């Protein structure tokens, strides 16, 4: 596929997780090919697999083809059949129910400054055990919910939570030789203020308790590591996922010998 990632996944033994959080550093990554490319950072909360995969998604995305501009914007997504025939962005199809219009779905976000002022998108997703509905909060304020009625596998809880970045490479390099940026456009090793991060890496267990998994409990995914990568930075209060990169310049020059 033409998608590349720098993501971490927390796999639970069953579908009993009752929520998750993500506090995502906001940036305005540049796209090499804005006709079709996109760059985003999000959470994915899921249950099932294959055609029974159900997802709850929220984060920021730079996708001019969909939003009409190059700003990072708040988005949501979902699927009830592994992206085969169900699911959509934002409120473009029936699915998500917005209850509070204080925050707009699709709103532009203020991007952080390299070596300067940082901005974060705090999102908290919580399952209501009376209904199975999954509620979304932004910076502590309610937005709405994904109702249990659209799902079949995630109605009682989730088995997997993933966090991180993704780019879509419309130029057909497989995401291996495009300067479309992920996160801030800088490699994770640059750290706070320079590389993008995801913090508040927390889940809610079956009993309703908040758990912050240790670094070793996540599986990492970075299939184009010379272009986009991730690095955990453990602070003394909470674990950071630094992720992203500048992408790879197309400087291969192989010929037979």
């Amino acid at each position: 596929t033409n998608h590349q990632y720098a993501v971490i996944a927390y796999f639970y033994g069953n579908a009993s997780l009752q929520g998750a959080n993500a506090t995502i550093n906001i940036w305005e990554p540049n796209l090499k090919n804005p006709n079709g490319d996109f760059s985003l950072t999000q959470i994915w909360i899921s249950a099932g697999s294959g055609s029974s995969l159900n997802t709850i998604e929220a984060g920021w995305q730079v996708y001019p083809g969909r939003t009409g501009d190059s700003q990072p914007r708040f988005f949501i997504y979902w699927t009830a059949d592994g992206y085969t025939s169900t699911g959509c962005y934002d409120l473009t199809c029936p699915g998500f129910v917005q209850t509070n219009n204080y925050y707009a779905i699709g709103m532009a976000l203020q991007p952080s400054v390299y070596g300067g002022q940082q901005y974060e998108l705090n999102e908290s997703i919580q399952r209501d055990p009376a209904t199975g509905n999954w509620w979304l909060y932004l910076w502590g304020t309610v937005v709405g919910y994904w109702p249990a009625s659209i799902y079949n596998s995630i109605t009682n809880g989730a088995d997997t939570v993933e966090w991180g970045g993704e780019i879509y490479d419309s130029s057909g390099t497989g995401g291996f030789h495009t300067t479309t940026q992920m996160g801030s456009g800088h490699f994770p090793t640059e750290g706070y203020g320079k590389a993008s991060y995801v913090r508040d890496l927390q889940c809610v267990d079956t009993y309703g308790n908040v758990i912050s998994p240790t670094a070793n409990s996540f599986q990492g995914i970075a299939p184009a590591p010379n272009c986009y990568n991730y690095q955990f930075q453990q602070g003394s209060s909470e674990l950071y996922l630094f992720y992203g990169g500048p992408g790879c310049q197309a400087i291969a020059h192989h010929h037979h010998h």
Partner: peptide, 4 residues
């Protein structure tokens, strides 16, 4: 999982 969901996104990878």
């Amino acid at each position: 999982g969901g996104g990878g």
